Amino acid sequence: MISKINGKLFADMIIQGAQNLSNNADLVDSLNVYPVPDGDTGTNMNLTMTSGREEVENNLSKNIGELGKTFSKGLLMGARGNSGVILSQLFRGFCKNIESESEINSKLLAESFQAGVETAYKAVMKPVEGTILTVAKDAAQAAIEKANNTEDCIELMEYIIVKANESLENTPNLLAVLKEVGVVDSGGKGLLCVYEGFLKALKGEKVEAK
Ligand SMILES: Nc1ncnc2c1ncn2[C@@H]1O[C@H](COP(=O)(O)OP(=O)(O)NP(=O)(O)O)[C@@H](O)[C@H]1O
Ligand SMILES: [Mg+2]
Ligand SMILES: [Mg+2]
């Protein structure tokens, strides 16, 4: 089990999350119908996440707060598209919440997801439901509920992914174009890919590069 996440474990989460998103970028692109069906959400999120990953790999730290500053900076100066901007804002708020910590427990992990949701909603002038914002929000609410009785960050992250997937599968019930075309939200799918990589890293595993 994982009771605390130090800066290197967070770096691994970032690296494996980035790799899993990269592997799925074409799939996420194939779903992009909203706002414009320009087929680029996966590429946009991948480029954004890659900018964060590259900064992290070049500047590792045992201290999670310092590593988060590095990740946040990389995302924010490489954010591409509506989805990449939102992704960068989710993680800006997440990392700000832990800036002074050396390691975090499951409760602070959950609180940091929630802080990211708040930052991202405030950054978008006209939020629309059925989107990456909804999936992030539902994931963070699940994280808070579960972490209150779950010390193990692996078990917590597994639950977050279950609930984030339920939210993603519900996106067509909130956003008409998704139901009419027959897809889930592309931004939300990209976020799930990052979270799945987070889980691999928490388990000490590696995402195979495609
Ligand atoms: N107003 C919004 N509120 C919430 N999420 C949004 C909003 N606008 C876009 N998104 C998210 O961004 C995803 C699309 O991202 P992306 O394909 O990178 O946009 P884009 O191609 O840069 N912009 P556009 O050409 O105007 O569609 C959607 O699937 C949603 O998850
Ligand atoms: Mg575009
Ligand atoms: Mg697009």
Swiss-Prot record:
Highest taxon of the lineage: Bacteria
Cysteine pairings via disulfide bonds: none
All residue ranges annotated as the DhaL domain in the record: 8-200
UniProt protein name: Uncharacterized protein SAOUHSC_01193
Organism: Staphylococcus aureus (strain NCTC 8325 / PS 47)
Lineage per the UniProt record: Bacteria, Bacillati, Bacillota, Bacilli, Bacillales
Full-sequence range covered: 1 to 210 of 548
